[PDB]
Design a protein around this ligand. Structure first.
Ligand SMILES: [Cl-]
Ligand SMILES: [Cl-]
Ligand SMILES: [Mg+2]
Lengths: 195, 231, 243, 244, 4, 222, 241, 250, 196, 204, 4
């Protein structure tokens, strides 16, 4: 797992997530997509304990999709994020808690605003212009504090993200095998194929 | 009449009609006979078929190396009760390294049946059983009825027209009781007893069922060509 | 009406007809008795010989509870066994917690409360037995009789079943003619006589006699069955009297 | 056993009706009439009290109209006690939704869960159904103003205007006659009271035999206000439309 | 947690 | 904490200091460690602050219901039994150390309860971190046949020993007097021997000292 | 009419099973009576041993519930003993939970509540008994409290129960009318017992031997029953009067 | 064994009546008259202590009960049903309110809880409805004085004044003539005593009448001093003597 | 603690010191470690104060209920109820209990129940921390069928020594006398017993 | 590994003349890493204000919980919950979780709308009520807040004076704590107007 | 904890 970032620009949310899956002294995989689509305008990336991450993500995805079918309606990113937080907040006092951290990036169609939520495994939720989990934040937050502007375009956002990935590839101890980038905007969710 | 809706209701003369109706399914059952000497105990059962294309329903079930029974009435109820017996015999072995007394087997069945004659929602067992065995005090034959009444006998019979055999055994008593050390003679007497209950039919090779247990014979069951010796 | 179709329902007179119907099952059964004596109790019962084929001595009907209590009953035999099984659990748990064997009055109420419990709900049926029981404890001998309603009292002598009246009359004579007390071995003989006398009222089928007793001196306060020379001797004493 | 005394509350008739639901509905038909009317700019709830005594404390009273959350209220026809059981359930259910999603519960979602509870009492558990019909009046930002009804069967439907309880046949005919889509709230207030006035089994409609509520956008800008009318406020609105 |  | 109980002629008196501590820090300078279980049964509590309050209210509640059910005035031994059996069930994890006292139809009573659930009877008792300072005083001055005023003095003297000599105790003395045939009198801040001296200077600031970024009116209304 | 078999209301708002439980109260054909002295509470009840085969000592309808509480039952013995065992358990538990002896009136209330439940919950039948509880309460003094199958209970100056109850009741009312007080103004319980037996004799119009009666006395700190001999001693003193 | 009655014993008939509730109300009709009157500075609740035998000591039987220090109740119908309702009502005031908020519940909410309990006896399996109607008089800081009637169905209503049981129809008429919104508490006691004589046959004195008020705080009834914000119970039972004092000036 | 119980001619006597310890601090110097579970069945308590009180309260409750149903329990029965509690809860209990009672049949009886919940019927028994120091003395000086005055002296002298050497024992010596004559409480103060 | 100081933050409350003030910082971090600069710790339920320090997930959870409980309270009681009552509800709710508590340090502030009295209170994580005339403090810089408050505070301050005092107590305490700061909010609460001011403070 |  390890690297997950998110930046919210003027008109979209961009999620970048590392492709490596490592167990022991072996990189088992270099094309892992650490993300699940929760609804057509909501995306969730995840990192944490092996097994727990996907099990949690798919479980949330199943619940949100059920809601969508039941009401013939898409839950707002704020609503989905609150649902997710509650699930993690319950979990933290279970017999065995989910050790998963998530970023939820969504485009709210009622407001016509992109939104990025950072939630850790304890159920600690915060809405942010840009977010990261794990050691990634220790390089990117300061970098983004410097270079980020609230009114950036999606293209400006991707260049800003190139800076973050470059820094992480320079200073991080591990080879995380690059990132898969995804954009969430008014037209839904799409994947950039050359990063 | 108004008092036969369930087992938890006495009639004004102190009867339990559901228990009596359970007793009735035994009466519709194919005949089976038990008898014993001092060295062996024998079960003979007439098996019944559906038609000429069908098998002949088994009426004898092994419970342990030293114990087993024959059934008359509802067969699934015999399966439940015989299975309980298998467990009880089993428990006696694993825990006490002790072969279960046939008398205790009797008491255990009585108490199991009785529970279903005093509580709402249940129902009495619809089957009668003849239990034979050889234990630390010799050969035994028991008669079980689903009223919970269990009775130790030298010989007996249950099912339709069992009164023929039960009369025969009543006269024959002094003879068969002293067929010691001779398996085949005790069986012959059993086969003759059951013949007193036949009507419009006689014992064929896939119709007769015999079992024997005793001093140096584990409870074993004879069917098919293995019973031709006795017809 | 319809008051008599469901256990635990009061009729307009204040009766539980289902218990009364259970009494009919008791009255329908074989005769059984108990005689209290100087330092113990004696129990006897008639076993009807349905057929030649019943193995004599081998369908025992008197039951021991713990080591010091005897129980006998008339009516539905399985119901009586169920009651004695509970009695055995009640005695075991008493001895477990309190060390001493269960006193007879204490034991009587354990059965009483359990039987009475089966007259409180429509989802159970009353017991189809009257039970005579007793033994010896630290305070002497006690004899008790317990009915389907849960009713029980202490008795000088007690009888139940088909020959209950015949037997009751016979008991009443002994109580009058032996006011200073009856010995254990006397009571054993008397018990045999009374069962033979009360067998008058049940006389198609001939019967097998069965006796037991607890006596502080004769059995050391333990319940034992009466067999061999003592049983035959008491049979003979009974045979004498019906001729 | 106890089977003897079981009415079997959850079975079908040979015609395929649920006896107890039908009989519960029959019970409700003698209850004080309640009316809901939906306008473009708000909703009205009006209901008639079961015939008053002069000594009843009428201002600190509530029998017909209950607040579920800030955006949703109900009008009751049937057993009050039965209704309160369901009302507290509905109130709790609203709060669970808010707690979970940080958004006020959509009106239909609340209505569906209550109706689902009722449905359960008709299919399992051997208990009697709730002898209650509700008119739900509420607002949410998906559908705006909404009226629904539910009844002991747990069936629910949406309405522009509807009545429950006594004389709904006459009342429904009258609403059908005078209702029109572009209606304002203040017109709907009048229609509601005029309809009760004509269907009432009393001699004349007075303030003390009524409960009244509006749900308007008539606070300040894009937000919604519930107004449960005080007795004096009903007395005024009864004059203002010339019924007294 | 305070104490007294 | 320091707390005490002292019997006298015609009743019983309890007292307590008023300091609450969070480690070395004084969390509360004037908390009430005297609790009313019923009108004429009062409790002084040391240990885990929340536990003494919670356990005292719970048993106070059940005593009220019991008093109503029985149509009788509650007895101290009932509070004692209910408290001790509750505390025992929790194996010490509910950290309540209590001196229970009161008057009832049976007379006047004084008990202590430790958190594991053992109880003690006495004419004078003390619990808490200051219990040794207090007990030194009680063992020095207690006698058989104290008057009400002697008992009050003795009790508050014992609490004072705790206040001065124990770092776990400070501030004020609370007292409660439960006399037979009379209403309990609860004397909150009976003694106040630790009044803060006048400060040397007023630290009230020139208005506008604090730099503000934004203002806004908060909507508390509907 | 299945509203007659279980404890649900009839159209006239009645509970027939409760009413029929009251009728079972008299099944035994015994009359009981209770009075209060200055220092004591006395309860006497008729003792009828029909069968000659019974052990007369085991025939009793008076129960020692606790050291201080006694209880006499009017009704069949199985229900009576059921109620006594429960009362004994409740009184012991109360002492353990609350650290003082259960008062007579509180026990009466508790047993009454239990009876009330049987009148409301369908699966339980009422007990066909009336329970008269007696003690010398440490707060209230001599006490008599009585429970019935309806779950009703109340305290009494004195009371009686059974088929010929009304005779005894009016007999006692007429005494208290005359005496002008709440109780038997007598020092010793021996004489209060004598009063109790005497007024039972007048009201029933019958004489008693020592084996026709059964007596329970409650004093401060013990409740006890009398032997045949303590009663004989008492019958003798009434005769020399 | 155990309760196999898990189905409702109260069900709708084809006409829509719930039989057992109707029949329970009939039991209340049979019951002795009780009433309550609401004054401007208090509430009074009263009933007849109709004794079973004159050997009974009827002070030991309390028909008017304290629920909280500011709330009292009286009933008409079946006494034993009332007794266990009071037990349950007292307890629920604590468990579902005082143990949560550290203060006693307001009248309407305690009433609401009692109503819930009575409603459940109307729908739960294996039980019959309660055979009583309650009148609950109470005070709380934000609602002031209030009077409620609770019926076997679980329904409750606020009253200025009302009566229940035997002679309720007559007594309700009497109260319509006399009640106004300016009654001072003493006037309400007086009217209650007049209304009650109509329906009482035999003796009419302070030993056969049970009567309580919700009025001023009673510091003398508190049991302790030193907390000046605790001022004492507003509920007070009038003594035998207090009633007789008001019967001579009748 | 120091505790003991001694059978003699007319019955049995229980004895104990009065010290409750909370560290090396004496939490109570006038404790009553002798405890009634029935009119003439008493126990001496040692170990945890909370455990032994909780146990004795339960036993008193059982025997009160026993009494109601079956009359006066034997001393053996009382000891059995203590055992059942101590044995079945041996992991969670620190209770060393001596049970002593007077029947009219059985005269005086003493049962000691150490930590594991075993039962031991003895002529006399000693227990508690202070008992270690008087095994020698008590074994040398005990005889059967002593008089009341001899038995009081034996207990007084024994506990005097236990208190002298054991820091966890002290205060007054309490005794409870159990005979046909009833129940007698004795107390002896330091100035008497110390200089014996 | 100490849940009460993973995220950091502080809350302080003070009484004045017919007013109360309650203030908090805006930091939410994960140990050394500052994560959010907008994490407010003060909430209100009608006119009753609640500040919560400690583990941020529990802060959020408890806010959601007390909104729930006060909403139902309002519906049933037909009035807004008062501070004295809310204080009791907070206490009950925390002690209900006695052996698995929320790792929080709540603070209640508001004016009773019947009596007009200003009211403040503080709690430990398991529900112990600390009522005070003067000030209540909470969070990772509580030692510092105690020091600032005990010296700066004086009774009966006017709202605009009280504002300066509480702000200076917060700011200077926050600056001596590594885990508190990153912004601050101060609520001045009078009987029926409430002003909310964001303070300018050092961003390190 | 208190010992004996
Ligand atoms: Cl109760
Ligand atoms: Cl101790
Ligand atoms: Mg920094």
């Amino acid at each position: 797992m390890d690297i997950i970032l998110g930046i919210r620009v003027q008109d979209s949310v961009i999620l970048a997530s590392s492709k490596a899956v490592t167990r022991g002294i072996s990189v088992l995989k270099d094309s892992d997509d650490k993300t699940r689509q929760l609804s057509p305008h909501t995306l969730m990336s995840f990192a944490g304990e092996a097994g727990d991450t996907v099990q949690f993500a798919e479980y949330i995805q199943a619940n949100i999709q059920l809601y969508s079918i039941r009401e013939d309606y898409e839950l707002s990113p704020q609503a989905v994020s609150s649902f997710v937080r509650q699930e993690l907040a319950k979990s933290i006092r279970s017999r065995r808690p989910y050790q998963v951290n998530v970023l939820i990036g969504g485009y709210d169609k009622k407001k016509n605003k992109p939104e990025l939520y950072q939630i850790d495994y304890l159920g600690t939720k915060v809405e942010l212009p840009y977010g990261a989990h794990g050691y990634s934040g220790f390089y990117t937050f300061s970098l983004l504090d410097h270079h980020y502007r609230p009114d950036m375009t999606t293209e400006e956002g991707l260049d800003l993200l190139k800076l973050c990935v470059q820094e992480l590839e320079k200073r991080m101890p591990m080879d995380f095998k690059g990132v898969i980038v995804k954009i969430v905007d008014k037209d839904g969710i799409r994947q950039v194929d050359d990063f | 009449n108004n008092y036969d809706g369930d087992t938890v209701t006495f009639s004004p003369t102190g009867r339990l009609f559901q228990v009596e109706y359970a007793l009735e399914a035994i009466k519709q059952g194919s005949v089976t006979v038990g008898l014993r000497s001092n060295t062996h105990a024998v079960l003979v059962a007439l098996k019944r078929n559906a038609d000429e294309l069908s098998s002949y329903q088994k009426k004898i079930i092994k419970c342990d190396e030293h114990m087993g029974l024959s059934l008359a009435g509802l067969a699934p109820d015999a399966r439940v009760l015989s299975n309980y017996l298998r467990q009880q015999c089993n428990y006696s072995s694993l825990v006490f390294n002790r072969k279960l007394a046939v008398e205790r087997a009797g008491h255990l069945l009585c108490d199991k049946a009785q529970k279903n004659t005093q509580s709402y929602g249940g129902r009495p067992y619809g089957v009668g059983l003849l239990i034979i065995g050889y234990d630390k005090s010799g050969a035994h034959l028991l008669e079980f009825q689903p009223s919970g009444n269990v009775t130790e006998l030298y010989g007996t019979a249950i099912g339709a027209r069992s009164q023929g055999a039960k009369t025969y055994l009543e006269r024959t008593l002094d003879t068969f009781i002293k067929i010691d050390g001779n398996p085949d003679e005790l069986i012959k007497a059993g086969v003759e007893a059951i013949s007193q209950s036949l009507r419009d039919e006689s014992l064929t090779v896939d119709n007769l069922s015999i079992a024997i247990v005793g001093k140096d014979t584990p409870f074993t069951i004879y069917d098919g060509e293995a019973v031709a010796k006795y017809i | 009406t319809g008051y008599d179709l469901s256990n635990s329902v009061f009729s307009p007179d204040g009766r539980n007809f289902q218990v009364e119907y259970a009494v009919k099952a008791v009255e329908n059964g074989t005769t059984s008795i108990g005689i209290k004596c100087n330092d113990g109790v004696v129990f006897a019962v008639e076993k009807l010989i349905t057929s030649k084929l019943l193995v004599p001595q081998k369908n025992v009907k008197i039951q021991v509870v713990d080591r010091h209590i005897g129980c006998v009953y008339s009516g539905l035999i399985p119901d009586g066994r169920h009651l004695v099984n509970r009695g055995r659990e009640e005695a075991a748990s008493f001895k477990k917690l309190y060390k001493t064997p269960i006193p007879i009055p204490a034991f009587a109420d354990r059965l009483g409360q359990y039987v009475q419990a089966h007259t409180l709900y429509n989802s159970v049926r009353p017991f189809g037995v009257s039970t005579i029981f007793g033994g010896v404890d630290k305070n002497g001998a006690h004899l008790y009789m317990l009915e389907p309603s849960g009713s029980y009292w202490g008795y000088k002598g007690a009888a139940t079943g088909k020959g209950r009246q015949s037997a009751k009359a016979e008991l009443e004579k002994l109580v009058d003619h032996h006011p200073e007390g009856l010995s254990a071995r006397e009571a054993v003989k008397q018990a045999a006589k009374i069962i033979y006398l009360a067998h008058e009222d049940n006389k198609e089928k001939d019967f097998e006699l069965e006796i037991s007793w607890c006596s502080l001196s004769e059995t050391n306060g333990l319940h034992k069955f009466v067999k061999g020379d003592l049983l035959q001797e008491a049979i003979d004493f009974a045979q004498k009297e019906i001729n | 056993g106890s089977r003897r005394y079981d009415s079997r509350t959850t079975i079908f008739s040979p015609e395929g009706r649920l006896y107890q639901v039908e009989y519960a509905l029959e019970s409700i038909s003698h209850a004080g009439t309640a009316i809901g009317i939906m306008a473009s700019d708000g909703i009205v709830l009006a209901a008639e009290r079961k015939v008053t005594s002069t000594l009843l404390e009428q201002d600190t009273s509530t029998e017909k109209l209950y607040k579920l959350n800030d955006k949703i209220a109900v009008a009751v026809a049937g057993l009050t006690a039965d209704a309160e059981i369901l009302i507290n359930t509905a109130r709790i259910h609203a709060q669970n939704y808010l707690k979970t999603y940080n958004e006020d519960i959509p009106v239909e979602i609340l209505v569906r869960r209550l109706s689902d509870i009722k449905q359960g009492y008709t299919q399992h558990g051997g208990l009697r159904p709730f002898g209650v019909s509700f008119i739900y009046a509420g607002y949410d930002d998906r559908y705006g103003y909404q009226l629904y009804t539910s009844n002991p069967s747990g069936n629910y439907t949406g309405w522009k205007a509807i009545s429950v309880g006594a004389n709904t046949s006459a009342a429904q005919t009258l609403l059908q006659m005078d209702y029109k889509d572009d209606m304002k709230v203040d017109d709907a207030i009048e229609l509601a009271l005029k309809t009760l006035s004509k269907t009432t089994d009393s001699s004349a409609l007075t303030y003390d035999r009524l409960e009244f509520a509006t749900i308007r956008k008539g606070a300040n800008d894009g937000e919604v206000y519930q107004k449960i009318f005080k007795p004096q406020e009903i007395k005024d609105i009864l004059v203002k439309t010339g019924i007294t | 947690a305070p104490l007294x | 904490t320091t707390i005490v109980g002292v019997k006298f002629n015609n009743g019983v008196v309890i007292a307590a200091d008023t300091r609450s501590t969070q480690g070395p820090i004084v969390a509360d300078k004037n908390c009430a460690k005297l609790h009313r279980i019923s009108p004429k049964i009062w409790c002084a509590g040391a240990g885990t602050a929340a536990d003494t309050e919670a356990v005292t209210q719970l048993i106070g509640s059940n005593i009220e219901l019991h008093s109503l059910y029985t149509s009788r005035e509650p007895r101290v031994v009932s509070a004692l039994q209910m408290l001790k059996q509750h505390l025992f069930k929790y194996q010490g994890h509910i950290g309540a150390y209590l001196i229970v006292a009161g008057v009832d139809p049976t007379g006047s009573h004084l008990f202590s309860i430790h958190a594991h659930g053992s109880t003690d009877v006495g004419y004078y008792l003390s619990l808490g971190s200051g219990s040794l300072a207090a007990m030194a005083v009680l063992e020095s001055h207690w006698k058989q046949d104290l008057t009400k005023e002697e008992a009050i003095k003795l009790a508050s003297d014992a609490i004072q020993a705790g206040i001065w000599n124990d770092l776990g105790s400070g501030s004020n003395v609370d007292v409660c007097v439960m006399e037979i045939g009379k209403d309990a009198e609860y004397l909150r801040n009976y003694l106040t021997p630790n009044v803060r001296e006048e400060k040397q200077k007023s630290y009230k600031f020139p208005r506008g000292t604090t730099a503000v970024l934004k203002e806004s009116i908060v909507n508390i209304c509907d | 009419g299945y509203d007659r078999h279980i404890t649900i209301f009839s159209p006239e708002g009645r509970l027939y099973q409760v009413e029929y439980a009251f009728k079972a109260t008299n099944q035994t054909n015994i009359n009981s009576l209770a009075v209060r002295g200055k220092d004591c509470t006395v309860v006497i009840s008729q003792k009828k041993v029909p069968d000659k085969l019974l052990d007369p000592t085991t025939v009793s309808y008076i129960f020692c519930i606790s050291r201080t509480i006694g209880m006499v039952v009017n009704g069949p013995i199985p229900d009576a003993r059921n109620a006594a065992l429960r009362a004994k358990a409740e009184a012991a538990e109360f002492r353990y939970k609350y650290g003082y002896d259960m008062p007579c009136d509180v026990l009466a209330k508790r047993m009454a509540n239990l009876s009330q439940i049987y009148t409301q919950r369908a699966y339980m039948r009422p007990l066909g008994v009336i329970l008269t509880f007696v003690s010398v309460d440490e707060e209230l003094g001599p006490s008599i409290y009585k429970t019935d199958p309806a779950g009703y209970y109340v305290g009494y100056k004195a009371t009686a129960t059974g088929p010929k109850q009304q005779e005894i009741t009016t007999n006692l009312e007429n005494h208290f009318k005359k005496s002008k007080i709440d109780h038997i103004n007598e020092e010793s319980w021996e004489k209060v017992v004598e009063f109790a037996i005497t007024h039972m004799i007048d009201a029933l119009g019958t004489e008693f031997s020592k084996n026709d009666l059964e007596v329970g006395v409650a004093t401060k700190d013990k409740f006890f029953t009398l032997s045949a001999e303590n009663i004989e001693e008492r019958l003798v003193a009434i005769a020399e009067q | 064994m155990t309760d196999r009655y898990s189905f409702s014993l109260t069900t709708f008939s084809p006409s829509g009546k719930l039989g057992q509730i109707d029949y329970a109300l009939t039991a209340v009709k049979q019951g002795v008259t009780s009433l309550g009157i609401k004054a401007t500075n208090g509430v009074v609740i009263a009933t007849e202590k109709k004794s079973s035998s004159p050997l009974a000591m009827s002070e030991t039987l309390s028909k008017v009960s304290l629920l909280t220090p500011d709330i009292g109740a009286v009933y008409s119908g079946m006494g034993p049903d009332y007794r266990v309702l009071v037990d349950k009502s007292r307890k629920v005031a604590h468990t579902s309110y005082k143990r949560i908020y550290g203060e006693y519940p307001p009248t309407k909410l305690l009433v609401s809880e009692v109503a819930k309990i009575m409603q459940e006896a109307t729908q739960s399996g294996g039980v019959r409805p309660f055979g009583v109607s309650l009148l609950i008089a109470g005070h709380d800081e934000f609602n002031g004085f209030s009077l409620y009637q609770v019926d076997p169905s679980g329904s409750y209503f606020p009253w200025k004044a009302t009566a229940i049981g035997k002679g309720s129809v007559a007594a309700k008429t009497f109260l319509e003539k006399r009640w106004n919104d300016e009654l001072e508490l003493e006037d309400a006691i007086h009217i209650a005593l007049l209304t009650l004589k109509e329906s009482v046959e035999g003796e009419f004195n302070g030993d056969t009448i049970e009567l309580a008020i919700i009025g001023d705080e009673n510091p003398d009834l508190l049991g302790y001093t030193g907390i000046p914000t605790d001022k004492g119970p507003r509920f007070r039972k009038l003594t035998s003597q207090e009633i007789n004092d008001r019967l001579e000036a009748l | 603690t120091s505790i003991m119980a001694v059978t003699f001619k007319d019955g049995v006597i229980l004895g104990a010191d009065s010290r409750t310890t909370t560290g090396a601090y004496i939490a109570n110097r006038v404790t009553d470690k002798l405890t009634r579970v029935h009119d003439k069945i008493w126990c001496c308590r040692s170990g945890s104060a909370a455990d032994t009180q909780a146990i004795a309260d339960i036993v008193q409750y059982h025997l009160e209920l026993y009494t109601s149903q079956y009359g006066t329990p034997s001393t053996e029965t009382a000891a059995s109820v203590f055992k059942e509690l101590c044995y079945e809860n041996k992991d969670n209990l620190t209770a060393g209990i001596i049970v002593a009672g007077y029947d009219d049949k059985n005269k005086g009886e003493v049962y000691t129940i150490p930590l594991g919940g075993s039962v031991h019927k003895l002529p006399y028994a000693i227990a508690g921390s202070g008992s270690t120091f008087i095994y020698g003395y008590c074994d040398k000086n005990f005889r059967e069928n002593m008089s009341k005055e001899e038995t009081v002296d034996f207990i007084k002298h024994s506990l005097s020594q236990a208190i002298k050497w054991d820091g966890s024992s002290g205060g007054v010596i309490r005794m409870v006398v159990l005979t046909a004559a009833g129940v007698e409480r004795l107390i002896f103060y330091p100035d008497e017993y110390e200089q014996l | 590994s100490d849940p009460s100081s993973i995220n950091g933050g502080i809350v302080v409350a003070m009484t004045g003349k017919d007013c109360v003030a309650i203030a908090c910082d805006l930091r939410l971090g994960s140990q050394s890493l500052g994560v959010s600069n907008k994490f407010e710790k003060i909430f209100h339920y009608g006119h009753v204000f609640l500040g919560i320090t400690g583990l941020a997930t529990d802060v959020t959870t408890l806010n959601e919980m007390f909104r729930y409980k006060t909403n139902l309270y309002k519906l049933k009681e037909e009035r807004a919950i008062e501070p004295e009552t809310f204080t009791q509800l907070v206490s009950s709710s925390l002690y209900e979780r006695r052996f698995g508590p929320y790792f929080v340090g709540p603070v209640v502030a508001g004016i009773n709308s019947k009596s007009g009295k200003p009211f403040i209170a503080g709690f430990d994580l398991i529900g112990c009520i600390d009522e005070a005339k003067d000030f209540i403090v909470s969070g990772t810089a509580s030692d510092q807040l105690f020091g600032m408050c005990e010296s700066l505070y004086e009774p009966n301050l006017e709202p605009e004076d009280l504002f300066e005092t509480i702000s200076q107590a917060l700011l200077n305490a926050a600056d001596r704590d590594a885990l508190s700061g990153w912004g601050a909010v101060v609520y001045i609460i009078k009987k029926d107007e409430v002003v909310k001011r964001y303070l300018k403070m050092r961003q390190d």
